[PDB]
């Protein structure tokens, strides 16, 4: 119970500021999220899958 929207974002932005390349690490972090989104969506829901890739 109760309220995520401001403290987690500050911690993640502060962790990526310690990486030698925050752009490459942002790209790398999305690899499991893309596969997970593919596995969660049945082959009938292909457009909900693309909307989830856009959101990611």
């Amino acid at each position: 119970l109760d309220s995520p929207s401001f403290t987690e974002d500050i911690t993640l932005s502060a962790v990526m500021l310690q990486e030698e390349d925050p752009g490459e690490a942002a790209t790398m972090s999305m690899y499991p999220d893309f596969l997970k989104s593919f596995l969660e969506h049945p082959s009938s829901a292909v457009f909900e899958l693309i909307e989830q890739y856009e959101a990611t």
């Binding site: 790209t27 790398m28 999305m30 593919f38 082959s43 292909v46 899958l49 693309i50 890739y53």
Partner: protein
């Protein structure tokens, strides 16, 4: 559709008799004098967007084959991810992609994941 147009208000004939194709737009974009547009037209995502608009999957697979041949180590990780998931998307829709190129994209992406 409207039988009663008064001829007294001519828009230019070039605009009214324009034979539009999807290809003719991208040919005109290649013929532009604007240096910035000619540079952006060579970016990998704008090439993908062009072929997606044209509905030409086979031409997109030829570009992917060329990019893999010009040096597997020069492809950015996000682009190989995108190419892989686009091929999985085409396969889910039952669209015919070049299997040889699809296998080579997958192998190159798997080798990146290993590294």
């Amino acid at each position: 559709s409207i039988i009663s147009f008064n001829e007294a208000n001519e828009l230019p004939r070039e605009y009214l008799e324009a034979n539009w194709t999807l290809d003719s737009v991208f040919e005109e974009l290649q013929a532009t004098d604007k240096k910035r547009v000619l540079e952006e037209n060579r970016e990998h995502y704008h090439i993908i967007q062009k072929f997606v608009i044209l509905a030409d999957v086979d031409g997109l697979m030829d570009e992917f084959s060329e990019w893999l041949s010009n040096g597997k180590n020069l492809l950015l990780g996000h682009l190989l991810r995108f190419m892989t998931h686009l091929l999985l998307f085409f396969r889910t829709l039952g669209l015919q992609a070049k299997e040889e190129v699809s296998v080579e994209v997958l192998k190159t992406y798997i080798q990146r994941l290993i590294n």
